[PDB]
Amino acid sequence: SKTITIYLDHASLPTLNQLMHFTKESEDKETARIFGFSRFKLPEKITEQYNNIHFVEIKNNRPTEDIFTILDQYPEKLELDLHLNIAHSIQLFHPILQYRFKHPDRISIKSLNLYDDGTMEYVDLEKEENKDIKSAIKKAEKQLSDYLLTGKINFDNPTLARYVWQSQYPVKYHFLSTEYFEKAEFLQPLKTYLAGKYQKMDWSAYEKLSPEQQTFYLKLVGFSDETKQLFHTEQTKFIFTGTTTWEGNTDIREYYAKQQLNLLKHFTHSEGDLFIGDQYKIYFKGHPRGGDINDYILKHAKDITNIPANISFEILMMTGLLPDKVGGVASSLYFSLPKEKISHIIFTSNKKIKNKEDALNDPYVRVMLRLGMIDKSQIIFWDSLKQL
């Protein structure tokens, strides 16, 4: 066989993981890789050292037909190691299935590594609390069997269907929060079904890396020495973390930036509802896909060290550069933080939240209550805050 290692992700959290996986094999310059992001994302000094590396576009949660053209170039017998995100695993797989119908004996699936895309996985599970989890698993297994036979997507329970890949392939899951699966009683049947099949997105597997692997990785993910110097001062440190939306609308986008800067004001200003104290030096960490929203913040923010948006927050924990305090809008990044470092986590919603009972029905709120990253007495959505 020839092995082909296919990384289908471009979102920050799964791609951060996948880039470390790749790092562990980086000396092998020969093996074929496919990445689901731009050829320009990574340093060309690094990528041009690789002989069988290609980059493919993901559109509407599927790789484009370029992946067919890329795999057509390998006439040998092929084993595919797929790395894909849990939330969209079904859609991302659709074209791989299509291609296998054309090349069944030459094209086999050696393994799946399935990583959380973010917190969507967790807010979708919240909606499943009163359902019969045991039978949903069985139903999903059969429907995945049909998917593999027909190539057609039909799942009664798309959320739970994400977790039944083991009934067809060798699979290993990497979870943002293993605890959610132990602490959520309704998920006991799922926890049992998946026993042995999962690990946590640890980030302590960065320690395991060679000192040289470490240096390579940091160049992949874009952490330089400048960025390291940003934290030289012995002064104590607060990082404001930003967010984004997946919406092309001006006003939805401006709304965001406006709310967010305002929110920053409330942590930093002594007139603020969340004022942290004058001891802290302030840093900004924009959302990787926040674009203009990050810009607006940097246009208006006095007295603030930017940590370039494209650097995933979790690198700070790997490298030991984590601050004393962190605050901002709810994000996957908080799931990595020791609790004493949290200043405040703020929520958003399309629904106007008028009271505590509205608040409690928010599924992100529920996730964080379930994991005890917040308690009930302090729930804040950012519209309820005032302009400063």
Ligand X SMILES: Nc1ccn([C@@H]2O[C@H](COP(=O)(O)O)[C@@H](O)[C@H]2O)c(=O)n1
> CB of 124: closest distance to ligand X in angstroms?
13
Residue among 64, 85, 95 nearest 12 (CA):
85
Q: For ligand X, which is the closer residue by CB, 85 or 241?
A: 241
Residue 175 to residue 180: CA distance in whole angstroms: 9
Size of the site for ligand X (CB under 6 A): 18
Residue 273 to residue 276: CA distance in whole angstroms: 9
Q: For ligand X, which is the closer residue by CB, 171 or 221?
A: 221
Residue 74 to residue 1: CA distance in whole angstroms: 10
DSSP class per residue in 30-59: SSEEEESS-TTSS-HHHHTT-SSEEE--EE
Residue among 97, 103, 125, 113 nearest 5 (CA):
113
| Residue for token pair 């969507």 | 120
Tell how far CA 114 is from the center of its chain.
12
| By the rule CB under 6 A, 288 interacts with ligand X | yes
Range in contact with ligand X (rule: CB under 6 A) among 27-35, 70-78, 281-289, 341-349: 281-289
> CB of 330: closest distance to ligand X in angstroms?
7
Which residues have C-beta within 8 Å of that of residue 330, sequence separation ≥ 6? 119, 243, 345, 346, 347, 348, 364, 368
Identify whether the C-beta of residue 369 lies closer than 8 Å to the C-beta of residue 375.
yes
Q: For ligand X, which is the closer residue by CB, 166 or 332?
A: 332
Tokens of 22: 């790749």
By three-state DSSP, how is residue 102 classified? helix
DSSP-derived letter for residue 347 is B
Identify whether the C-beta of residue 363 lies closer than 8 Å to the C-beta of residue 347.
no
- Checking DSSP bridges between strand 325-329 and strand 237-241, what pairing results, if any? parallel
Which residue number places its CB atom closest to ligand X? 331
Q: For ligand X, which is the closer residue by CB, 64 or 245?
A: 245
> CB of 333: closest distance to ligand X in angstroms?
5
Q: Side chain identity at 207, as an amino acid letter?
A: E
Q: For ligand X, which is the closer residue by CB, 239 or 353?
A: 239
When binding is defined by CB under 6 A, the residue of 89, 119, 159, 166 that contacts ligand X is: 119
Q: For ligand X, which is the closer residue by CB, 113 or 119?
A: 119
> CB of 37: closest distance to ligand X in angstroms?
14
Give, as ranges, the residues between 310 and 349 that touch ligand X (CB under 6 A). Answer: 312-314, 331-333
> CB of 190: closest distance to ligand X in angstroms?
22
| By the rule CB under 6 A, 242 interacts with ligand X | yes
Range in contact with ligand X (rule: CB under 6 A) among 10-18, 51-59, 204-212, 245-253: 10-18
Which residues have C-beta within 8 Å of that of residue 211, sequence separation ≥ 6? none
Q: For ligand X, which is the closer residue by CB, 95 or 118?
A: 118
Q: For ligand X, which is the closer residue by CB, 64 or 262?
A: 262
Range in contact with ligand X (rule: CB under 6 A) among 55-63, 239-247, 337-345, 373-381: 239-247
> CB of 15: closest distance to ligand X in angstroms?
9
Range in contact with ligand X (rule: CB under 6 A) among 63-71, 222-230, 235-243, 267-275: 235-243
Binding site for ligand X (CB under 6 A): 12-13, 16, 118-119, 241-243, 285-288, 312-314, 331-333
